[PDB]
Amino acid sequence: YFRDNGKHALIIYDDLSKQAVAYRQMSLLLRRPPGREAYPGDVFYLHSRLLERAAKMNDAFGGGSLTALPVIETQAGDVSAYIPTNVISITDGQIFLETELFYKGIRPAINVGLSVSRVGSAAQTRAM
Amino acid sequence: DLEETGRVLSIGDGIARVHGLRNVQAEEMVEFSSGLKGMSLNLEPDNVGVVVFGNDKLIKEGDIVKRTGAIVDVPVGEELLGRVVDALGNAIDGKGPIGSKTRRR
Amino acid sequence: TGTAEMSSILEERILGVDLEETGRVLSIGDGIARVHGLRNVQAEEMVEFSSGLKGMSLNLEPDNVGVVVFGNDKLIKEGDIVKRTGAIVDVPVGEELLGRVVDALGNAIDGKGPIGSKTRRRVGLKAPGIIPRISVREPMQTGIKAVDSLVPIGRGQRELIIGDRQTGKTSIAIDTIINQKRFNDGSDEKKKLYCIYVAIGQKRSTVAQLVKRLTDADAMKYTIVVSATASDAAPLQYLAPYSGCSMGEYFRDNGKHALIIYDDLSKQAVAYRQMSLLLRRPPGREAYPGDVFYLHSRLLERAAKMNDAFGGGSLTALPVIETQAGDVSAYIPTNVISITDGQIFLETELFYKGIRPAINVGLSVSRVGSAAQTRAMKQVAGTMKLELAQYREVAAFAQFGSDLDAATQQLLSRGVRLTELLKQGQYSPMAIEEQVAVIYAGVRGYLDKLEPSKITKFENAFLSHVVSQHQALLGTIRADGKISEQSDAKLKEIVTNFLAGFE
Amino acid sequence: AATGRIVAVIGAVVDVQFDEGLPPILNALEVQGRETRLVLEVAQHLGESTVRTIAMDGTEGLVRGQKVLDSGAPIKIPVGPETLGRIMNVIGEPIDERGPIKTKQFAPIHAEAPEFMEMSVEQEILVTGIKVVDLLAPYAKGGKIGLFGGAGVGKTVLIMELINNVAKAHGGYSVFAGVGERTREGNDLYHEMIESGVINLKDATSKVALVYGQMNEPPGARARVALTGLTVAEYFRDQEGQDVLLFIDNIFRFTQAGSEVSALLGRIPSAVGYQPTLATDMGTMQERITTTKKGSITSVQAIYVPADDLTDPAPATTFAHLDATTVLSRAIAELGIYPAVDPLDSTSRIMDPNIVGSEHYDVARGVQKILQDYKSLQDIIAILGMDELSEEDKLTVSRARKIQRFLSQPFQVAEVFTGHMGKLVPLKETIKGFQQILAGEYDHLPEQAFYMVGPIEEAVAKADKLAEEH
Amino acid sequence: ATGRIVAVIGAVVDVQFDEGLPPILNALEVQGRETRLVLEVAQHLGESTVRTIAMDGTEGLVRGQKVLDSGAPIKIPVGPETLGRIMNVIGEPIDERGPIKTKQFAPIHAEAPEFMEMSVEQEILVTGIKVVDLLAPYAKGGKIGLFGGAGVGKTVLIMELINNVAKAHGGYSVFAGVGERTREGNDLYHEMIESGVINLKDATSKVALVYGQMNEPPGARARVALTGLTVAEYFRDQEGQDVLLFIDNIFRFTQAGSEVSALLGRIPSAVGYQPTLATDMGTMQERITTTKKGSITSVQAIYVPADDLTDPAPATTFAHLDATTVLSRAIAELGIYPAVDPLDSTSRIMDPNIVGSEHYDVARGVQKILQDYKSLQDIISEEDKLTVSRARKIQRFLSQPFQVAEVFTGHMGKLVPLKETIKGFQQILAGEYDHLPEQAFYMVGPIEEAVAKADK
Amino acid sequence: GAGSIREAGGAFGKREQAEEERYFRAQSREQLAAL
Amino acid sequence: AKLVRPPVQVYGIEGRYATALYSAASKQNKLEQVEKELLRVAQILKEPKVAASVLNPYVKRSIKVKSLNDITAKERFSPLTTNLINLLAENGRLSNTQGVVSAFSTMMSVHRGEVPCTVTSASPLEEATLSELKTVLKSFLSQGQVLKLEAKTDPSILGGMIVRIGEKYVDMSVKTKIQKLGRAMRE
Numbered sequence A: 001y002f003r004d005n006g007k008h009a010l011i012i013y014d015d016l017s018k019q020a021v022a023y024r025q026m027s028l029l030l031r032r033p034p035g036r037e038a039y040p041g042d043v044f045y046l047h048s049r050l051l052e053r054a055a056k057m058n059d060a061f062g063g064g065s066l067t068a069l070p071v072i073e074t075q076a077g078d079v080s081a082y083i084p085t086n087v088i089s090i091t092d093g094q095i096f097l098e099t100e101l102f103y104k105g106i107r108p109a110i111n112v113g114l115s116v117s118r119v120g121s122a123a124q125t126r127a128m
Numbered sequence B: 001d002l003e004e005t006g007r008v009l010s011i012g013d014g015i016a017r018v019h020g021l022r023n024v025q026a027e028e029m030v031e032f033s034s035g036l037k038g039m040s041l042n043l044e045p046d047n048v049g050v051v052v053f054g055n056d057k058l059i060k061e062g063d064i065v066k067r068t069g070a071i072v073d074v075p076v077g078e079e080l081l082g083r084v085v086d087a088l089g090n091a092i093d094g095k096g097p098i099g100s101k102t103r104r105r
Numbered sequence C: 001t002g003t004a005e006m007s008s009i010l011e012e013r014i015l016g017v018d019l020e021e022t023g024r025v026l027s028i029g030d031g032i033a034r035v036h037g038l039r040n041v042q043a044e045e046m047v048e049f050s051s052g053l054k055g056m057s058l059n060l061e062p063d064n065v066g067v068v069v070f071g072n073d074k075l076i077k078e079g080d081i082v083k084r085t086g087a088i089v090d091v092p093v094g095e096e097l098l099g100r101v102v103d104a105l106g107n108a109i110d111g112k113g114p115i116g117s118k119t120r121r122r123v124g125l126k127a128p129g130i131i132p133r134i135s136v137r138e139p140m141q142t143g144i145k146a147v148d149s150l151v152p153i154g155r156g157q158r159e160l161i162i163g164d165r166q167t168g169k170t171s172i173a174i175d176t177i178i179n180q181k182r183f184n185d186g187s188d189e190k191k192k193l194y195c196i197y198v199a200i201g202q203k204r205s206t207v208a209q210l211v212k213r214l215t216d217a218d219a220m221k222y223t224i225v226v227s228a229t230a231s232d233a234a235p236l237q238y239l240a241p242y243s244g245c246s247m248g249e250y251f252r253d254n255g256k257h258a259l260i261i262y263d264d265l266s267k268q269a270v271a272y273r274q275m276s277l278l279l280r281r282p283p284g285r286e287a288y289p290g291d292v293f294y295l296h297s298r299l300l301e302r303a304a305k306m307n308d309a310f311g312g313g314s315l316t317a318l319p320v321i322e323t324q325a326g327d328v329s330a331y332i333p334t335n336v337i338s339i340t341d342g343q344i345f346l347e348t349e350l351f352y353k354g355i356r357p358a359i360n361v362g363l364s365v366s367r368v369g370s371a372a373q374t375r376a377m378k379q380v381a382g383t384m385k386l387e388l389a390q391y392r393e394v395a396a397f398a399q400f401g402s403d404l405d406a407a408t409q410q411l412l413s414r415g416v417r418l419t420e421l422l423k424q425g426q427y428s429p430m431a432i433e434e435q436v437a438v439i440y441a442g443v444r445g446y447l448d449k450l451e452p453s454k455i456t457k458f459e460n461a462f463l464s465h466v467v468s469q470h471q472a473l474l475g476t477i478r479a480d481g482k483i484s485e486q487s488d489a490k491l492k493e494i495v496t497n498f499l500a501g502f503e
Numbered sequence D: 001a002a003t004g005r006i007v008a009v010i011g012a013v014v015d016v017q018f019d020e021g022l023p024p025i026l027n028a029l030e031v032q033g034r035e036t037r038l039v040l041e042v043a044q045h046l047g048e049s050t051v052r053t054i055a056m057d058g059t060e061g062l063v064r065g066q067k068v069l070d071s072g073a074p075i076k077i078p079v080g081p082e083t084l085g086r087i088m089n090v091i092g093e094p095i096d097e098r099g100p101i102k103t104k105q106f107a108p109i110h111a112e113a114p115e116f117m118e119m120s121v122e123q124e125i126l127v128t129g130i131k132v133v134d135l136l137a138p139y140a141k142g143g144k145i146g147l148f149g150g151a152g153v154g155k156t157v158l159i160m161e162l163i164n165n166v167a168k169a170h171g172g173y174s175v176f177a178g179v180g181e182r183t184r185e186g187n188d189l190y191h192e193m194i195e196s197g198v199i200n201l202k203d204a205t206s207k208v209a210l211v212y213g214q215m216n217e218p219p220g221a222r223a224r225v226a227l228t229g230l231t232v233a234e235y236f237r238d239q240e241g242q243d244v245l246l247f248i249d250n251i252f253r254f255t256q257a258g259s260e261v262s263a264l265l266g267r268i269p270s271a272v273g274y275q276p277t278l279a280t281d282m283g284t285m286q287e288r289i290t291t292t293k294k295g296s297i298t299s300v301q302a303i304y305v306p307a308d309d310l311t312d313p314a315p316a317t318t319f320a321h322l323d324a325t326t327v328l329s330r331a332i333a334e335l336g337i338y339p340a341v342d343p344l345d346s347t348s349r350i351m352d353p354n355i356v357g358s359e360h361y362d363v364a365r366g367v368q369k370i371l372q373d374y375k376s377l378q379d380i381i382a383i384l385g386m387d388e389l390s391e392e393d394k395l396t397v398s399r400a401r402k403i404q405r406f407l408s409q410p411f412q413v414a415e416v417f418t419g420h421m422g423k424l425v426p427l428k429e430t431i432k433g434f435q436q437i438l439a440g441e442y443d444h445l446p447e448q449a450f451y452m453v454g455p456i457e458e459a460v461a462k463a464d465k466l467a468e469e470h
Numbered sequence E: 001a002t003g004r005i006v007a008v009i010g011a012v013v014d015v016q017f018d019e020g021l022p023p024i025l026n027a028l029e030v031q032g033r034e035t036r037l038v039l040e041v042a043q044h045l046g047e048s049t050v051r052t053i054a055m056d057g058t059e060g061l062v063r064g065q066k067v068l069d070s071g072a073p074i075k076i077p078v079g080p081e082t083l084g085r086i087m088n089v090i091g092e093p094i095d096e097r098g099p100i101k102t103k104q105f106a107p108i109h110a111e112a113p114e115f116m117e118m119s120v121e122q123e124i125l126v127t128g129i130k131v132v133d134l135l136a137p138y139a140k141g142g143k144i145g146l147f148g149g150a151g152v153g154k155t156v157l158i159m160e161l162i163n164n165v166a167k168a169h170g171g172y173s174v175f176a177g178v179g180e181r182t183r184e185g186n187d188l189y190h191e192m193i194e195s196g197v198i199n200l201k202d203a204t205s206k207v208a209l210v211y212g213q214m215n216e217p218p219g220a221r222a223r224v225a226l227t228g229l230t231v232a233e234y235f236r237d238q239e240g241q242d243v244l245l246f247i248d249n250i251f252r253f254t255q256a257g258s259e260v261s262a263l264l265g266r267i268p269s270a271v272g273y274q275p276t277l278a279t280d281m282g283t284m285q286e287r288i289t290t291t292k293k294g295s296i297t298s299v300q301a302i303y304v305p306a307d308d309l310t311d312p313a314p315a316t317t318f319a320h321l322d323a324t325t326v327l328s329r330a331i332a333e334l335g336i337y338p339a340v341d342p343l344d345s346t347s348r349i350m351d352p353n354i355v356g357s358e359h360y361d362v363a364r365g366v367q368k369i370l371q372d373y374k375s376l377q378d379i380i381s382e383e384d385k386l387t388v389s390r391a392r393k394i395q396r397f398l399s400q401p402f403q404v405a406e407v408f409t410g411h412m413g414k415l416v417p418l419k420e421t422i423k424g425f426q427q428i429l430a431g432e433y434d435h436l437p438e439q440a441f442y443m444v445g446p447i448e449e450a451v452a453k454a455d456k
Numbered sequence F: 001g002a003g004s005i006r007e008a009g010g011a012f013g014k015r016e017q018a019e020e021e022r023y024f025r026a027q028s029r030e031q032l033a034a035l
Numbered sequence G: 001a002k003l004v005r006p007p008v009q010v011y012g013i014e015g016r017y018a019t020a021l022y023s024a025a026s027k028q029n030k031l032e033q034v035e036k037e038l039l040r041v042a043q044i045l046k047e048p049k050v051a052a053s054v055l056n057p058y059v060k061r062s063i064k065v066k067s068l069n070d071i072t073a074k075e076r077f078s079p080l081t082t083n084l085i086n087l088l089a090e091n092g093r094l095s096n097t098q099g100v101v102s103a104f105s106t107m108m109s110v111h112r113g114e115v116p117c118t119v120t121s122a123s124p125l126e127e128a129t130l131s132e133l134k135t136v137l138k139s140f141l142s143q144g145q146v147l148k149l150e151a152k153t154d155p156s157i158l159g160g161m162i163v164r165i166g167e168k169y170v171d172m173s174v175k176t177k178i179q180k181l182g183r184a185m186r187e
């Protein structure tokens, strides 16, 4: 609604792993056949048709925007799991948080080695 | 009389699907026509799944399954001391039968 | 409920056609046709669809037939008519196929006309038993020094070329095919080897490049190429290895010797797994069917050495297997390693360390062994194998070897020299006597004083030398099959004088 | 034509029952009663006069009993010169808001692959201007290339750099197919091409056709958009003889799309959740992307590697369908080296001394050997430290680090990321530079002078400036 | 009873009968075929239909083809006439030497001996091999895992065990080639012919061969072990012998059972093995035991998948193994034959209450001195050179010349009794021969031959 | 398995990278002053 | 060949066999004869002796097929229903027989134009009001339609009437109105 009216909005999905779990429950109870880790076959579509709706519009359409900050919880740091890799392949970058960095005093525990912003300096102020 | 007796529909995977035994209880001991025994595991609207205590080679499709009316039980007592029995309480040491007066589920 | 309980069939039965030799497609999907009727069809029988496509009856069920389609699904619709052919699948065989590129059914795909063969052979015949065979006794020469010396192959063996992607497996197969030109040109008829290359699930461009490479080396006049490429139906990629095996069994049955390369069996197993999963057969480990080992084992047991009462012919098999990150404990690698008589193992680290062919000699094995060698290659390769085993034992001490005793340093030096001796260039197989001369120079100690980076150069120059001015000793070693004492002295003199005059 | 009714709707799978005239498999069906166009592609004949179909768009609002019309053919897209400068979707509709694509001919997106007699054995190097690619794994004119990489290693940047270099050094109707990738990236590529004159909005002399099915599309659209782009390129190759470039980003999505409908098409899963038909689907799609005797198609495909596996069935099945595979490593991207090409994992079929020459082959093999030796020496460095190696080992490590830095190259399309300016290095310049670093002609220059430069002259100049300032 | 094929899916055949449904495990004969096709009943599916696994290929089978019920499980010829012959899983000869003219046929499916037929105390099976009898002895009616494959003289040890059990005990042998390579089966047949263990001219053959080839369907490979076990069961229960039964390989028996269970649609268990893995292994192995008439001792070649000893197939096989003989190449490349690794070979009856105190103490001393010698070799003192000398002499004296090699090497073969082995190693450990040279013990029988070789 | 210590990114790969970077930054400072 | 689909649809084994019989009878336009014959065979098999004999799995299939042939020929049945029962006995779906009949029946119920009508009320309605109700509900249908009305009573709606005509549905119960007032006051 804000994106289409020239206004700018920000949305946080906290978190998408639990949405994937709920969708898996609905699908397994609808007797749709399970896939990897019992998740339905179209869980990637589930998250991509959602995360594609975050967009910056041009002037002819108002100039509004919608930023999306999806959240994903990994098990024991396994970034290679099904839903984590899906959402990583979808989004425009990741902010990786670590438990070792957290307990070593680095708070917020952002892993600057892995954390990437595919937009980068294109969306910064000149001083910054 | 399909209330105390049934006919084996299928046998395999250690399970016998039996047709009949309308008055059989869940977890009841049944006796096959070949001398083997089984336990009624799944009471279903149209059959009884029976866990066979023995080899499926001895049970054929169409065999008669009588019901013993007793939930699976074994002989107990002092009379078992010194005896070697199998899982069903039958003596396998050749010293004759077990003279037990009490059974226990 | 039920495949043949469709309302059309039931309505026709309620109303009150030949269902013996003819059937109707109940359903079609993903290359599987459920066909009504066909009550006289046999298991694994060929059938004809109305559009001209062929199929094979794999599932004979109480009310339908599961037919795998040799083509595209779009040409088959519900209600199409299926006819029996009355025969199990069979291919054409004979010497008429030498020089041709055919598909999994023996149909020419090179435009050079129809295969004018007269004999046909069933693709699913059983292998020879215990008695028709004899022990594998005569060398199958690959022309590669590492193979011919350390992993020898005999006529009748089944040696697996296994390794990760892009390691040099097809190159080993093609060098082996090119090598046999010296025997097929000559007059000795018991050394002639006819080759069959079965390509399963490859690009058509790859097979075109391979056929061009074999034509440039003049190796096509004795080679059959069976190609079931990646765009072919899974039934055709499943059937191509057996077509090639029947084409080679024609030679094995007539006192001749054939070599067959299945490149590769991983893709055939994948095609068979697809066909089985779509037929709703119970999947196992990695979704593979329960009889995939049976598949590859009944394919590979057909390579045999026959005794003299059955013609004395042979069929040698070189199956190829692609592992994923060196995982030989995967399902299909495990099966094929269990079936074969040894494996030539190729590595990526060896490849990029300059060792080409990247044959890992520690992991490679031949169970036939020295029985598949000549007396000269025996003489030199026993010593070479012992020395390379010692070098592999002490190799971890390298990069520190300068601070170790003289025995360790000598083991390291001899090992580096022999390792540099086993390198080879692509599409250039050597004769067995030149390999013997090179290994003789290597193991007798005429390379220890030389620098490693020079060894290759020596091995090249020396070779040219001994090919020009010492053809008599080469002919003697080749005709006698062994290094006689006179030949040993002549080799010693040649190598010491060349090294004395070498730069 | 034939008219049927929708009898089932589960997700993106629609079962349609026909009374008369069951349509063959692969036909396109039009759902009647919809404001936008919904095409259903027939996949299976279920018996009972019913077919199962995959929807090319969303299935929301579909009703059981809704009427469906048989087209009588597979999905047919406009082909011809008039597709150049336009963006079309999986079913051939223009999505750039510039009116209908008026061509004289339509082509079905499902066609047979070229025969064996139609193949061409000619191999000729296609110089790209990228040092690592030109040297260690050169591309071929009319060959299939393939770019492997995980998420965020540089597949998109590398494919845009290749677009820039080759497709501007080319005059032969390039084609780009966006398969299941980001829409922001598609807009960015469209406006880059409009700005750089490759697409011409007025004065229609553009030289690239665009086909886009992105992440928000259902699995059917993402599974057939690669075939739509392939069909445009096939028309350009066959119906004109032209030499064509085809850039597919990302082709993994194609395979992925299939998986997302497999269980709904009634198919027992295979390994890693993939369809049983992964290999044959990939083969029927990939065997059409090829150079024949009729014309040339140089294909550059980006291939996503899930979780950096490379043993996953999709990349592992794609490997055998290529002629020069370039593998992007995350470990090299973490070293700051870009492009992140893995020198010990990328392979070309024309890396043959009888094709490229003995000097190029020897330099490439020496680079790979010194990098493998560096890998081996890193363990001894880890245990002992760098101050305990024989001076020749230290020389090997130094030259290997210099070769690693010099393999990196600044891209024109990366000026926003890097800051540096782009370089386009010729083939012989690359060979000479690496030959000299291998021979030892720069053991005095520091290793940081070779990082992010063009030819070796720039390395010497950067070393001079570093010495001056530092 | 006559039925007709109603379904053919691979190696699974559904056969429908109209009267007298055959029990499970019965063999049925498919009619109208050039070669004998035998199906084995696995399940009763209902509606008078049974499901069966084929023992041969099913190509060319037609729905409706007649099938005869044999009335019993697969029956194989059993008797002394099977010795020296080769038969397949269904008992027909595959060596082209004519029919096997025994008087009786036995079904390959039989229950294990009852509880009151078991032997209540374990005895040793003396093989005449010094390293085996001393350090890792075999038990009568036990199972022995034979580790090590090609290049360590596995076939020579097999043939020597056959010869030695035939001489010392008068008990014949059966060899079951489960999943056998046809090339290696021909090789084994001819090595047995040359070494006299098989005799094609008179009735002095010592071993009977049963080959289930590697290119046969998984049912044949799952039942060939039972065929061999049935031959051995005849030799035990009808002639009171101490039979040897070789199973090569046992992992292939497990693999064939897993493939058969997967073909029948059963849900795989852990690592993909049949859910009935333990009970299949048990029903096979429990028939290998000592009864009151005789015994069957089984030597079984063990293959370990991925070198994982906790894999379900070895872990299930190891629950039945009474001993282990490890053939090492580090011992063969050292010069010792047989190449048994004396520190890795184990035995369960290596217990003072079973083999006695003297045997146990001699074996423990030998093993301790060999471990000490390994430790000392690691660091290459006062008496440690003496330990090195005694241990090298022990290593040499573990060697032995075999009779089945006399033709190839000339050296006479030695069948050392148990007492002579025990006392020879006891004397070497005490120090009675610390003056005799090192090579006076290499390739000799009893210690008297060592002193007679030291004289020279 | 060549280069697997650094490839595992453990406590030994990090110290290997630190050693290489220390040594070669010292060598780069030594090579730049002499240029 | 093209198959004639019944006006309503039934699924499963029974629905499939009923669709088959409906097509095969509408081709020969013999729908009412087979309707009465299916009622006859249903009344025949429902009799306990036959329902026990021919529903027995441990007696051979061919014997029960022969007995069904006997019982269908002896009672003067058309060839359509005759080979329909023969097909049911051959496939082994005899247990589904009644189901098939039921399915067929409801098909004919909508082929005659009979729409179900439920009129739930808190009390037994008045007969003249019931006639007026039937009259006005006639107007909810097209031509060739007839209400099959079953005015079951539920006293928990407290008044009014809940009418369902096929799938059309009016909820005039007073309890619905009171719940709407409650939701309106609370929201």
Ligand SMILES: Nc1ncnc2c1ncn2[C@@H]1O[C@H](COP(=O)(O)OP(=O)(O)OP(=O)(O)O)[C@@H](O)[C@H]1O
Pocket (backbone or CB within 6 Å): C164, C165, C166, C167, C168, C169, C170, C171, C172, C356, C357, C424, C425, C426, D320, D348, D349, D351, D352
């Ligand atoms: N002995 C050699 N010397 C030099 N180069 C070689 C040698 N052998 C192979 N190569 C090269 O290594 C590359 C890969 O070899 P090849 O394709 O034959 O093996 P492959 O395992 O079958 O590959 P793929 O994974 O595509 O099936 C080829 O370019 C080949 O030219």
Ligand SMILES: Nc1ncnc2c1ncn2[C@@H]1O[C@H](COP(=O)(O)OP(=O)(O)O)[C@@H](O)[C@H]1O
Pocket (backbone or CB within 6 Å): A116, A117, A118, A119, A120, D149, D150, D151, D152, D153, D154, D155, D156, D157, D158, D338, D339, D411, D414, D417, D418
């Ligand atoms: N050639 C390059 N030079 C500098 N940075 C790069 C280069 N390639 C990639 N990157 C960085 O890595 C990020 C990922 O870019 P991208 O091409 O989208 O990778 P991929 O498509 O494989 O996920 C980029 O945003 C950029 O920050």
Ligand SMILES: [Mg+2]
Pocket (backbone or CB within 6 Å): C169, C170, C263
């Ligand atoms: Mg290859």
Ligand SMILES: [Mg+2]
Pocket (backbone or CB within 6 Å): D155, D156, D181, D250
């Ligand atoms: Mg990308």
